[PDB]
Amino acid sequence: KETAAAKFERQHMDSSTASSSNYCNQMMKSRNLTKDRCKPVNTFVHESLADVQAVCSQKNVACKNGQTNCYQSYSTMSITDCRETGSSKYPNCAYKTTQANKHIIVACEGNPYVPVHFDASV
Amino acid sequence: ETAAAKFERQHMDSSTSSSSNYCNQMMKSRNLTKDRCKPVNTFVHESLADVQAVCSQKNVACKNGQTNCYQSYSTMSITDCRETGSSKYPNCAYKTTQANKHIIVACEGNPYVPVHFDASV
Ligand SMILES: O=c1ccn([C@@H]2O[C@H](CO)[C@@H](O)[C@H]2O)c(=O)[nH]1
The CA distances from residue B62 to A114, B41, B90, in Å, are 23, 17, 31
Please name each of the domains of chain B with its CATH number: 1-121 (3.10.130.10)
- Determine the Cα–Cα distance for residues A10 and A50; give it in Å rounded to an integer: 15
Contact by Cβ (8 Å): A84, A94: yes
Nearest CA to ligand 1 atom 15: B41
- Determine the Cα–Cα distance for residues B49 and A97; give it in Å rounded to an integer: 17
SS3 sequence of chain B: CCHHHHHHHHHECCCCCCCCCHHHHHHHHCCCCCCCCCCEEEEECCCHHHHHHHHHCEEECCCCCCCCEEECCCCEEEEEEEECCCCECCECCEEEEEEEECEEEEEECCCCEEEEEEEEC
Torsion sign, CA atoms A50, A54, A56, A61: negative
Determination method here? Answer: X-ray
Which of B34, B35, B71 is CA-nearest to residue B56? B71
Q: A85 CA to chain B: closest CA distance, Å?
A: 23
The DSSP 8-state label assigned to residue A66 in this structure reads: S
Question: Which chain A residue lies closest to B71 (C-alpha atoms)?
Answer: A10
- Determine the Cα–Cα distance for residues B37 and B93; give it in Å rounded to an integer: 8
* B117 phi-psi bin (left φ>0, alpha ψ -120 to 50, beta other): beta
The enclosing H or E element of A26 equals helix A23-30
Contact by Cβ (8 Å): B68, B106: yes
**At how many Å resolution was this determined?**
1.8
B49 CB within 8 Å of a chain A CB: yes
Please state whether beta strands A59-61 and A70-72 pair in parallel, antiparallel, or not at all (unpaired). antiparallel
Confirm or reject: Cβ of B18 under 6 Å from ligand 1.
no
Enumerate the β-bridge partners of residue A101: A78
Q: Which strands, in side-by-side order, build the sheet including A104-109? A: A59-61, A70-72, A104-109, A114-121
Which of A97, A80, A85, A94 is CA-nearest to residue A13? A80
CB-neighbour burial class of residue A49 (10 A; exposed 0-12, middle 13-18, buried 19+): middle
How far, in Å, from the CA of A78 to the mean position of ligand 1? 36
Q: How far is CA A83 from the centre of its chain?
A: 12
CB atoms near residue A21 (< 10 Å):
9
Which of A38, A75, A31, A28 is CA-nearest to residue A55? A75
Angle at A27 (CA atoms; ends A62, B100), nearest 5 degrees: 125
Contact by Cβ (8 Å): A72, A40: no
